[PDB]
Design a protein around this ligand. Structure first.
Ligand SMILES: *[C@@H]1O[C@H](CO)[C@@H](O[C@@H]2O[C@H](CO)[C@@H](O)[C@H](O)[C@H]2NC(C)=O)[C@H](O)[C@H]1NC(C)=O
Ligand SMILES: *[C@@H]1O[C@H](CO)[C@@H](O[C@@H]2O[C@H](CO)[C@@H](O)[C@H](O)[C@H]2NC(C)=O)[C@H](O)[C@H]1NC(C)=O
Lengths: 66, 49
């Protein structure tokens, strides 16, 4: 349902989280297209204790390297 | 499978995920359901009872 980077659930703005076994991606509902889980396609709103089934994984910040 | 079985083959999806998708359908976003899932389950069970 969500992804916990640093104590914060990251829900997908559009599409669902999928993992090809080891690496988690965000894809649309009606067509499989994996995308790296960034802050653009995910919105953070939560505490990461209430959601059930949340996986930890990690998110990629497109501004930190720059 | 939610609505996916109404279009083609049934796409097996978890029920909390399907419910969050239904909430996204009506402009409520997934975080509401994933933060109130126990309350929603209790309300649904009470209504069905
Ligand atoms: C899931 O997909 C990812 C691709 O995002 C795989 O990661 C590797 O990514 C590099 C990119 O530099 C590719 O060159 C590799 O071919 C990818 N690995 C594989 C096995 O294809 C990741 O390994 C995939 N996970 C599984 C279990 O297949
Ligand atoms: C996901 O990250 C969380 C971050 O809070 C970690 O949860 C830890 O769980 C252990 C076991 O109860 C506690 O002792 C720690 O205090 C928790 N926090 C940290 C920062 O270690 C853990 O790394 C991951 N948990 C799961 C279930 O994947």
């Amino acid at each position: 349902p969500a992804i916990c980077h640093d104590g914060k659930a990251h829900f997908p703005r559009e599409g669902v989280f999928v993992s090809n076994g080891t690496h988690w991606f965000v894809t649309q509902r009606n067509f499989y297209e994996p995308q790296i889980i960034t802050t653009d396609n995910t919105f953070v709103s939560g505490n990461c204790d209430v959601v059930i089934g949340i996986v930890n994984n990690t998110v990629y910040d497109p501004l930190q390297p720059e | 499978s939610g609505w996916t079985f109404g279009a083609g083959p049934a796409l097996q999806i978890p029920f909390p995920m399907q419910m969050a998708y239904r909430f996204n359908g009506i402009g409520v976003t997934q975080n509401v359901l994933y933060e109130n899932q126990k309350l929603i389950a209790n309300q649904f069970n009470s209504a069905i009872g």
